[PDB]
């Protein structure tokens, strides 16, 4: 047995989600859904095909064709953004089926400007490495570029940059990471991180002073 | 009724995967208790139920290789899941089985989840990591708000849990998703940002778990300012 979910549904703040679960003779077996929030293990929030557990908001409700079902929330709100799953039990062959998720994404959020912060290395020089932290929060949509220089020169070796993660407030938050040995840490008059968000700049320098 | 999954983070291929949960609130007699993992990245994939008079059954891929079973005792069920490779790799979910007595056919789902203890099958050892405070510079200050953090570098396997005064402070929280490195070995950063009057009259203090290695750290991070 099998259960078809399409695996992406965009939705604008405030409109009605429908996520849609199909299989053969779905009508005469029971279907539940369960919602996974980035970085959490999923919660049940309907059962035995409409039923909503408790402390679920009623903006969640779980309906039933003959052939699928279909998780509609209502109003949605950015906090909504997670995987939903539809499972069913196969009687026949005592089987636990779940779908294949579909990831549902909150578009036309209002814009939000990064802050950034960067951090120098200090207790770090003395395991013998040096790495400078850009840390870039709060922003919206979840989009950066990072650049950075040393005086005035464009640095790309040693950088890595994390791919930008949604806070608990629902913005995005990223990190990039410039490593450099000590000795080339004190051997700049400065370094710079320039993060470009929709089409603006912002621009954090710091000097060698632990 | 609440869930504790434990367990190695780490296991050799080829050798055995042993999962325990935890079951209070409950006795374990009463329920079907089910496990369930998810691949990075991927979809819930259903692994086995157990009740204790011995009723179980499993995924049919793994059936030959994983057995589930219930300590009364100590009012714990478990996973033991041989020969495992890389496609073990995966968060494994300790859940409790809820059912409705309609004859017709099986109404079964699961509620609640534990949170989850991701096993990552290598052959490459246990690595502790070496945490070091991002604190706030003299200029760092953005208006009203300061952010500082914890780095915390060169561990293996995932994951590294990161809370503020223990677990009092979370708002404005973030950790961030760990770098994979050239060197096999994960970094991560984990920031705060709060009232910048705090930095004057606030102690903060990340705590780092990396469980797989037995590490704990309390780290101070002490402005700059």
């Known amino acids: 047995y099998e259960l078809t979910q399409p695996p992406s549904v965009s939705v604008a703040p405030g409109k009605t989600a429908r996520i849609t679960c199909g299989g053969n003779?779905?009508?005469?077996?029971?279907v539940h859904w369960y919602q996974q929030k980035p970085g959490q293990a999923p919660v049940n929030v309907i059962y035995?095909?409409?039923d909503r557990p408790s402390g679920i908001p009623e903006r969640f409700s779980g309906s039933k064709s003959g052939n699928t079902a279909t998780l509609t929330i209502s109003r949605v709100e950015a906090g909504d953004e997670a995987d939903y799953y539809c499972?069913?039990?196969?009687?026949?062959?005592?089987?636990?089926?779940f779908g294949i998720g579909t990831k549902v994404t909150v578009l036309g959020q209002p814009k939000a400007n990064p802050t950034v912060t960067l951090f120098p290395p200090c207790e770090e020089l003395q395991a013998n490495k040096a790495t400078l932290v850009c840390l870039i929060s709060d922003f919206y949509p979840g989009a950066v570029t990072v650049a950075w220089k040393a005086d005035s020169s464009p640095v790309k070796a040693g950088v890595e940059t994390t791919t930008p993660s949604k806070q608990s407030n629902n913005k995005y938050a990223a990190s990039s990471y410039l490593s450099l040995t000590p000795e080339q840490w004190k051997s700049h008059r400065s370094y710079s991180c320039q993060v470009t968000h929709e089409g603006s700049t912002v621009e954090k320098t710091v000097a060698p002073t632990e | 009724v609440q869930l504790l999954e434990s367990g190695p983070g780490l296991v050799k291929p080829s050798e055995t995967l042993s999962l325990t949960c935890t079951v209070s609130?409950?006795?374990?007699?009463?329920?079907?208790w089910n496990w369930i993992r998810q691949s990075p990245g991927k979809g819930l994939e259903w692994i086995g139920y157990?009740?204790?008079?011995?009723?179980?059954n499993y995924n049919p891929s793994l059936k030959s290789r994983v057995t589930i079973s219930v300590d009364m005792s100590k009012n714990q069920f478990s996973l033991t899941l041989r020969s495992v490779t890389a496609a073990d790799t995966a968060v494994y979910y300790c859940?409790?089985?809820?059912?409705?007595?309609?004859?017709?056919?099986?109404?079964?789902?699961?509620?609640?989840w534990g949170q989850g203890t991701l096993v990552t099958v290598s052959s490459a050892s246990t690595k502790g990591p070496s945490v070091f405070p991002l604190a706030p510079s003299s200029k760092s200050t953005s208006g009203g708000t300061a952010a500082l953090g914890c780095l915390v570098k060169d561990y293996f396997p995932e994951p590294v849990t990161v809370s503020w005064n223990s677990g009092a402070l979370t708002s404005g929280v973030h950790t961030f998703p760990a770098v994979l490195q050239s060197s096999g070995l994960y970094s991560l950063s984990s920031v705060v940002t709060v009232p910048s009057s705090s930095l004057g009259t606030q102690t903060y203090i990340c705590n780092v778990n990396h469980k797989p290695s037995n590490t704990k750290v309390d780290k101070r991070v002490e402005p700059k300012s």
């Open positions: 003779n779905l009508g005469t077996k029971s």
């Open positions: 609130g409950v006795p374990i007699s009463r329920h079907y």
């Open positions: 157990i009740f204790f008079n011995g009723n179980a």
């Open positions: 499972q069913v039990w196969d009687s026949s062959r005592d089987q636990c089926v």
């Open positions: 859940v409790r089985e809820k059912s409705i007595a309609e004859e017709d056919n099986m109404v079964r789902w699961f509620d609640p």
């Open positions: 035995y095909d409409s």
